[PDB]
Design a protein around this nucleic acid. Structure first.
Lengths: 735, 95, 249, 513
RNA sequence: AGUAGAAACAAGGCC
RNA sequence: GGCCUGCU
């Protein structure tokens, strides 16, 4: 007899055992080298899906741009980006009519937010492409570098501390004859108008790793800092709009998505009488981002912001204006090998414009030949369409408009449709009195989608009777069925620290028990395995064992020293008291009454040199990138113990010409620590104002010395010493 | 905690018997003319049964065993298993 | 005394003097987050990879003057080589366990008073009474429920001023809290935590967690109470219901 | 005031539809625009070939997935799974308890019958004498440790030319600048093409078959948990004990422990001894039916230079494992192995005593930080499998208002289709389903690859379509040929994915009736 | 050689 | 031969 697990589906329905079809117990695919090939392929594919448009050359950037809008209507089922302006404007108008007051309200709240938003909001972001160094750097670092360059060039309106003022300075920089940047190898280099325009309109391309569910790798993009404020405002407007649309599912979580899917299916099927047939289409959109033209987003926003202050319209329109002229950096480059001479070489992507094509294979040779005409200063113009879901929410708005355009008031026919859209994925429930009606409805829905630059993937889509469908790895079969294979990768040690890892693991087990219908015995097994892996990872074994490690000696002496050994934490080699009933309690508090007072005091000592807290945002928040989803943050319950240390940093900056960044880091951190000691609320509430550091610090020294004498340790001798030391630092700052 | 005793019956004097209880554990007995008598617990044994009888347990099978040897007519009782919960008892008759 | 003294020492050197002079208060946050350290994409892989090194964690410089450089057999506990972009020094994990067996001891009696939420959870569970498990299909319907069982009927911003006035009374600014509920909360949490020396930031964070109301969407069947939702994993399942009554009731 | 002016205004004039000249004019047009049935006009004018016609999906529609043809598929695992041999000592130590080298030496001294090693099956691409010399070097240095005072916790080996070749040392081309190497004709890109095509072989099927079989040992010693206080906790503990009794005596659990231990040791050695080659004996500790604890030594691993910077950087090692399976019967499964003859073994059998040969499978393999990390988390296969089984049990128990675990595991009345025999489809008890799912998860973790992910997704789609067909839900497709081509492009050379495709074809053949 | 698979590793750089 | 780094 030959064993075959798949035959199990002959008795258990597919959805009731779908977890077996998710090989999420092995290493996910990773990219190894350059992503330049993928970037070039994506650029060429985006440009050839809109080949029948019209070509122009921008007078500012001098780059060739392709406009397919209002182009010839498609005559085949292949992907097409020839969106029609009038059709999309009409779709938005019908969306407004079905939801009166949506645009005006959303614009009002967006106007409030834009005129009260601060610059620091831009620091709350992941890697961004700093143009000062032409590389990806943390959002805060890139923002600081750009602000420094602007201030050195004379653009100091951002000193007002307002994001709108920062954007005003950004736009004013566009009209400058010559800017100056700094490079280390420090050298001051001058950038002319066109070079700075291209550096501000460019995107950095990388390869996406840890992407499960496809054989081929893809490319993703990261924009600069000049354009992120406009993107933030536009996405704020789009989120405020989608929050008023029940057909959208992008700005919500997973459980809300499931609830809305259940509600829509029940509404569609229940209202349908015996005569009407119902069919569900589990649709995926092929080349979703490559076929969405930024000009059409400009049209949608300018229709949304009608009868609004002109400044609001301008600030919200700046973003799509820059995306329509966006450029993409090709990537890291290409690495060549010569086996005859036994050597390797790494050529940067910027040489692709001039480098001969003898080194490249046929596929890459043709890709380079096709993309060369669009190469301007080492970057390729990508006007026709978006690169990687930067305007997720606006795309969801367009999809929701398409979904609502079939409310049976615009169809003008017996058939009708509804459903749920989340960018690149949708479920469409279509009802009609007969199979011919369903066919006509789906055909018209597809045709209308093709008029908006949205394509339906026929290969990854199928239609059945309502009651069974899929949506973003959520399988609905007369009710959503748990999978538990999507969350399997999150059952190990997170990698934050000991206490954080313990709390995160127990909380993940608890949550997957609540949401993903994890069984009790399975949860106990998960707890046991997690504890085993945790002890084997942090070298913290039970203590009563003879497992020799680098940490087994101190742990054993602590074990033999303690009297009530049941109170020792698993991190210190103690027994595990966790169970299904204790999954919502931190380890420290669960073992508090069992700890010896000496060990308890040594553990939770504020003066410990290991605990370090930076800001209110990073107290008990851990960023865990979930499998098959975007990066997410979790609140984990933990007590600040000596085990809450933060791990070592990379330390490879020491071998790079960018070595002075560490000295600047140290000096900035010293100044920030001094300010915090002067202003204790610096972390919890970020200080605001327009004065400089030393003014506030010296003046508060004055006052605090005064009052702490009026009652406290200070003495006249010390108070006068502080006053004249303040005068000394004053005259020092003078010179 | 539900408990089922097995392994009782009619036996010869001087014979041997292995009681088992499928489920801390005790074995207790009740003769027809009396209340509960302590036998063994898990180890400790009563004076009337010490050296003759052995209590053991498998915590992976969830079972407590009472191995009775060199049985006397005075061991004739219903033998009940108990968890710190009562079984229904298994009849042991020695003759 | 000291604080202004390292201030003067910083202003002595030209670079830090320039940083202090030209940098305005508003930019405080930016430069504080200014770092070359990228946020890790795969934390688990490197935590499993770094812990195999010697000196894998980081600690303040003060550790060099509280913990000896080596233990009894000579296993090193800390190194004097500083981190990449900080004055902290890289140290071995043993320096943690050492601190828990011979490090300085204090009076942790006030931690229960600080971490009110977690200890209240423990107390509620310790006095709970379980019941029989009933096996029947559960119709889990998704609903919006409040998870925090100690929220004082305050929002984030609404309680943020209360938290500042409780911890940072001088940086409150214009705001003087009007609602009398906030008055009593300030009085209680002021007299209760009058000398607690854990940290201002952690105290503020835990006060925010305790007082601020927070809500999330979850699949529930029955219950719906704040105390009954924290144990939602233990009382409700796919085909079984476990009757439970927390210690509070 | 937020005024668009200067260069940024001109950019706004170049981001409009084709027939617009200025942002002012376009905004005026938008403000003056009102819906006047424009979608209908273009829908009528648009060509009718733009359609989404639904193709009915019937029993006769789906065709079997085509498998690639070529040379048979080879073995890719980092250790022997079906052909492993165990040398034991019967010590009382626990899994992590003990010192590796002393345990390995003590286990190896338990076997008598060593012979001078000789080549049996060559690597066919390497230098087998290097493997022979490496084996003899390992033996010599093991004796060298045996002689001295106290067995070191970790040993470093000498860097002889033998292991320099076997571990691929000083073979990475030296990195230079392009401006200095441009006239070299041979200079070109790295080889970037579709992998070699290979056809499925019957050995993977038998390997999976015997990976789901019971054993005479318990290969899982679970940790401690808080004493159960609630009745639901008691039910959970009883269920967990049942599953542990079912799966502990399973070759899948032994493979899990082998992989976890090997990858943990390899990662720790790579992170600690980055420069110098290190010896690590393959150790796994089990418990016999009698209850006596026992250690088992499959062989040795020599880790090489492991200066791993990126998550994809490769650390090369050489693995040696004892076995009794003659490699002269399925040579195509051992394309990358070099197999020597090292001794003779005598296992008690009623046919006098066999006195079988005892060979050494030696090969050069490699891994990476990501692969090591994911192979050291193989214990979540237990989770996956037993979560599936517990979901089955809960779903069935929601029907009958009572816990149904005990009768499922003891009565064994209900059975699920878990394989096909030439007679027909064979059904097994719930425990066999547990073991089968555990083996499937273990093989997913062992033979993981992008092909597996792609095939899994594109075949789950077709499985859902087929399930809809079997449920009488009138399924339909827009382009089924496209889906088939998407599935068939994932099957290239991986034995596991090809076996999964064969299983899918068999399921289609048995289904659709 | 080997790992791996649309490009890489099989140490890097600095003296 | 000596020293530096391992997500920059």
């Amino acid at each position: 007899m030959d064993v075959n697990p798949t035959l199990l589906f002959l008795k258990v329905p597919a959805q009731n055992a779908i977890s077996t079809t998710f090989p999420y117990t092995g290493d996910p695919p990773y990219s190894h080298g350059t992503g330049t090939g993928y970037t070039m392929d994506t650029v060429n594919r985006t440009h050839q899906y809109s080949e029948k448009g019209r070509w122009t050359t921008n007078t500012e950037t001098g780059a060739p741009q392709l406009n397919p809008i209002d182009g010839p209507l498609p005559e085949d089922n292949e992907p097409s980006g020839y969106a029609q302006t009038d059709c999309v404007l009409e779709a938005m108008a019908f969306l407004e009519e079905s939801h009166p007051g949506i645009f005006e309200n959303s614009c009002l709240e967006t106007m409030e937010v834009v005129q009260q938003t601060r610059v620091d909001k831009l620091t709350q972001g992941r890697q961004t492409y700093d143009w000062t160094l032409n590389r990806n750097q943390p959002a805060a670092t890139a923002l600081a570098n750009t602000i420094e360059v602007f201030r050195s060039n004379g653009l100091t309106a951002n000193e007002s501390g307002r994001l709108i003022d920062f954007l005003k300075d950004v736009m004013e920089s566009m009209d400058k004859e010559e800017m100056e940047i700094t490079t280390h190898f420090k050298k001051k280099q001058r950038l002319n108008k066109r070079s700075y325009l291209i550096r501000a309109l460019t995107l950095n391309t990388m390869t996406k790793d840890a992407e499960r569910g496809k054989l081929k790798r893809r490319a993703i993009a990261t924009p600069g800092m000049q354009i992120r404020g406009f993107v933030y405002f536009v996405e704020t407007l789009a989120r405020s709009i989608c929050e008023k649309l029940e057909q959208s599912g992008l700005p919500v979580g997973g459980n809300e998505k499931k609830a809305k899917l259940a509600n829509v299916v029940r509404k569609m099927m229940t209202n349908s009488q015996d005569t009407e047939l119902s069919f569900t289409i589990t649709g995926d959109n092929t080349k979703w981002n490559e076929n969405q033209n930024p000009r059409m987003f400009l049209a949608m926003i300018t229709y949304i912001t009608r009868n609004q202050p002109e400044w609001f319209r301008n600030v919200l329109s700046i973003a799509p204006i820059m995306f329509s002229n966006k450029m993409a950096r090709l990537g890291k480059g290409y690495m060549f090998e010569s086996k005859s001479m036994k050597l390797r070489t790494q050529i940067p992507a910027e040489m692709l414009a001039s480098i001969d094509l003898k080194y490249f294979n046929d596929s890459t040779r043709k890709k380079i030949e096709k993309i060369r005409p669009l190469l301007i200063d080492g970057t390729a113009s990508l006007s026709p369409g978006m690169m990687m879901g930067m305007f997720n929410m606006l795309s969801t708005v367009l999809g929701v408009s398409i979904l609502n355009l079939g409310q049976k008031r615009y169809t003008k026919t017996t058939y009708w449709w509804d459903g749920l859209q989340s960018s690149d994925d949708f479920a469409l429930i279509v009802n009609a009195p007969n199979h011919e009606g369903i066919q006509a409805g789906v055909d018209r829905f597809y045709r209308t989608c093709k008029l908006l630059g949205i394509n339906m993937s026929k290969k990854k889509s199928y239609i059945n009777r309502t009651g069974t469908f899929e949506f973003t790895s959520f399988f609905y079969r007369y009710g959503f069925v748990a999978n538990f294979s999507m969350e399997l990768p999150s059952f190990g040690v997170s990698g934050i620290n000991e206490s954080a890892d313990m709390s995160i693991g127990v909380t993940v087990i608890k949550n997957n028990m609540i949401n993903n219908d994890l069984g009790p015995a399975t949860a106990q097994m998960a707890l046991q395995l997690f504890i085993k892996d945790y002890r084997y990872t942090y070298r913290c074994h039970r203590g009563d064992t003879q497992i020799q490690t680098r940490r087994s000696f101190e742990i054993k002496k602590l074990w033999e020293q303690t009297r009530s050994k049941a109170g020792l934490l698993v991190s210190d080699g103690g027994p595990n008291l966790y169970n299904i009933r204790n999954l919502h309690i931190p380890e420290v508090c669960l073992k508090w009454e069992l700890m010896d007072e000496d060990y308890q005091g040594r553990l939770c000592n504020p003066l410990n040199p290991f605990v370090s807290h930076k800001e209110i945002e990073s107290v008990n928040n851990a960023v865990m990138m979930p499998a098959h989803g975007p990066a997410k943050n979790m609140e984990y319950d933990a007590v600040a113990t000596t085990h809450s240390w933060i791990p070592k940093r990379n330390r490879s900056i020491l071998n790079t010409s960018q070595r002075g960044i560490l000295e600047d880091e140290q000096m900035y951190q010293k100044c920030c620590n001094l300010f915090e000691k002067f202003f204790p609320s610096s972390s919890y509430r970020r200080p605001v104002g327009i004065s400089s550091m030393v003014e506030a610090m010296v003046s508060r020294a004055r006052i605090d010395a005064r009052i702490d004498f009026e009652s406290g340790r200070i003495k006249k001798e010390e108070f006068a010493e502080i006053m004249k030391i303040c005068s000394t630092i004053e005259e020092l700052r003078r010179q | 905690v539900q408990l089922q005793e097995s392994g009782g019956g009619l036996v010869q004097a001087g014979a041997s018997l292995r009681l088992s209880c499928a489920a801390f554990m005790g074995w207790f007995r009740q003769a027809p003319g009396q209340e509960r008598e302590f036998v063994a617990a898990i180890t400790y044994y009563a004076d009337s049964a010490k050296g003759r009888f052995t209590i053991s347990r498998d915590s992976a099978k969830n079972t407590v065993y009472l191995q009775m040897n060199s049985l006397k007519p005075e061991d004739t009782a219903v033998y009940y298993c108990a968890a710190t919960y009562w079984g229904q008892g298994t009849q042991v008759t020695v003759s | 005394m000291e604080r202004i003294k390292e201030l003067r020492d910083l202003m002595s050197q030209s670079r830090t003097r320039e940083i202090l002079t030209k940098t305005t208060v508003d930019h405080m946050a930016i430069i504080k987050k200014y770092t070359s350290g990228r946020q890790e994409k795969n934390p688990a892989l490197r935590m499993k990879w770094m812990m195999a090194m010697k000196y894998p964690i980081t600690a303040d410089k003060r550790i060099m003057e509280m913990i000896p450089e080596r233990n009894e057999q000579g296993q090193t506990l800390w190194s004097k080589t500083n981190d990449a972009g900080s004055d902290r020094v890289m140290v071995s994990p043993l320096a943690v366990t050492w601190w828990n067996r011979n490090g300085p001891t204090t009076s942790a009696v006030h931690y229960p008073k600080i971490y009110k939420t977690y200890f209240e959870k423990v107390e509620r569970l310790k006095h709970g009474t379980f019941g029989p498990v009933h096996f029947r299909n559960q119709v889990k319907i998704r609903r919006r429920v409040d998870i925090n069982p100690g929220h004082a009927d305050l929002s984030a911003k609404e309680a943020q001023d209360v938290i500042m006035e409780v911890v940072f009374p001088n940086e409150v600014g214009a705001r003087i809290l009007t609602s009398e509920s906030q008055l009593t909360i300030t009085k209680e949490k002021k007299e209760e935590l009058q000398d607690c020396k854990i940290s201002p930031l952690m105290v503020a964070y835990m006060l925010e967690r305790e007082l601020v109301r927070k809500t999330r969407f979850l699949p529930v069947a029955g219950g719906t109470s704040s105390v009954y939702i924290e144990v939602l994993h233990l009382t409700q399942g796919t085909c079984w219901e476990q009757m439970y009554t927390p210690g509070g009731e | 005031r937020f005024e668009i002016t200067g260069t940024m205004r001109r950019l706004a004039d170049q981001s409009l539809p084709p027939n617009f000249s200025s942002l002012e004019n376009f905004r005026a047009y938008v403000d003056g625009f009102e819906p006047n049935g424009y979608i209908e006009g273009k829908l009528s004018q648009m060509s009718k070939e733009v359609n989404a016609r639904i193709e009915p999906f019937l029993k006769t529609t789906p065709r079997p997935l085509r498998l690639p043809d070529g040379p048979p598929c080879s073995q890719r695992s980092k250790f022997l799974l079906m052909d492993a041999l165990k040398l034991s000592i019967e010590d009382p130590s626990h899994e992590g308890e003990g010192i590796p080298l002393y345990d390995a030496i003590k286990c190896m001294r338990t076997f008598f019958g060593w012979k001078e090693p000789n080549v049996v099956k060559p690597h066919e691409k390497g230098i087998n004498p290097n493997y022979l010399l490496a084996w003899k070097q390992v033996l010599a240095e093991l004796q060298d440790i045996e002689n001295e005072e106290k067995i070191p916790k970790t040993k470093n080996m000498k860097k002889t030319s033998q292991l320099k070749w076997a571990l691929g040392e000083n073979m990475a081309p030296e990195k230079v600048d392009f401006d200095d190497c441009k006239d070299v004709s041979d200079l070109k890109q790295y080889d970037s093409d579709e992998p070699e095509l290979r056809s499925l072989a019957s050995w993977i099927q038998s390997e999976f078959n015997k990976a789901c079989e019971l054993t005479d040992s318990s290969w899982i010693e679970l940790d401690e948990i808080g004493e159960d206080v609630a009745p639901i906790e008691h039910i959970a503990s009883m269920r967990r004990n049942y599953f542990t009794a079912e799966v502990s005596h399973c070759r899948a659990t032994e493979y899990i422990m082998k992989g976890v231990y090997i990858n943990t040791a390899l990662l720790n050695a790579s992170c600690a001894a980055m420069d110098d080659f290190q010896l690590i004996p393959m150790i796994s500790k089990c418990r016999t039916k009698e209850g006596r604890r026992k250690t088992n030594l499959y062989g040795f691993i020599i880790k090489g230079r492991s200066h791993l910077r990126n998550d994809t950087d490769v650390v090369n090692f050489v693995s040696m494992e004892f076995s009794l399976t003659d490699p002269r019967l399925e040579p195509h499964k051992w394309e990358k192995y070099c197999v020597l003859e090292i001794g003779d073994m005598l296992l008690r059998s009623a046919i006098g005593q066999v006195s079988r040969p005892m060979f050494l499978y030696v090969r050069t393999n490699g891994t990476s930080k990501i692969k090591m990390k994911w192979g050291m988390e193989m214990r979540r296969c237990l989770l996956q499998s037993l979560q599936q089984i517990e979901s089955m049990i809960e779903a069935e128990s929601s029907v009958k208002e009572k816990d149904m675990t005990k009768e499922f595991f003891e009565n064994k009345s209900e059975t699920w289709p878990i394989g096909e025999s030439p007679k027909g489809v064979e059904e097994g008890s719930i425990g066999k389903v547990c073991r089968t799912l555990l083996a499937k998860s273990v093989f997913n973790s062992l033979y993981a690859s992008p092909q597996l992910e792609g095939f899994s997704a594109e075949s789950r789609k077709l499985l859902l379509i087929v399930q809809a067909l079997r449920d009488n839900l009138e399924p339909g497709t827009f382009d089924l040929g496209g889906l088939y081509e998407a599935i068939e492009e994932c099957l290239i050379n991986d034995p596991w994915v090809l076996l999964n495709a064969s299983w899918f074809n068999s399921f289609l053949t048995h289904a659709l009736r």
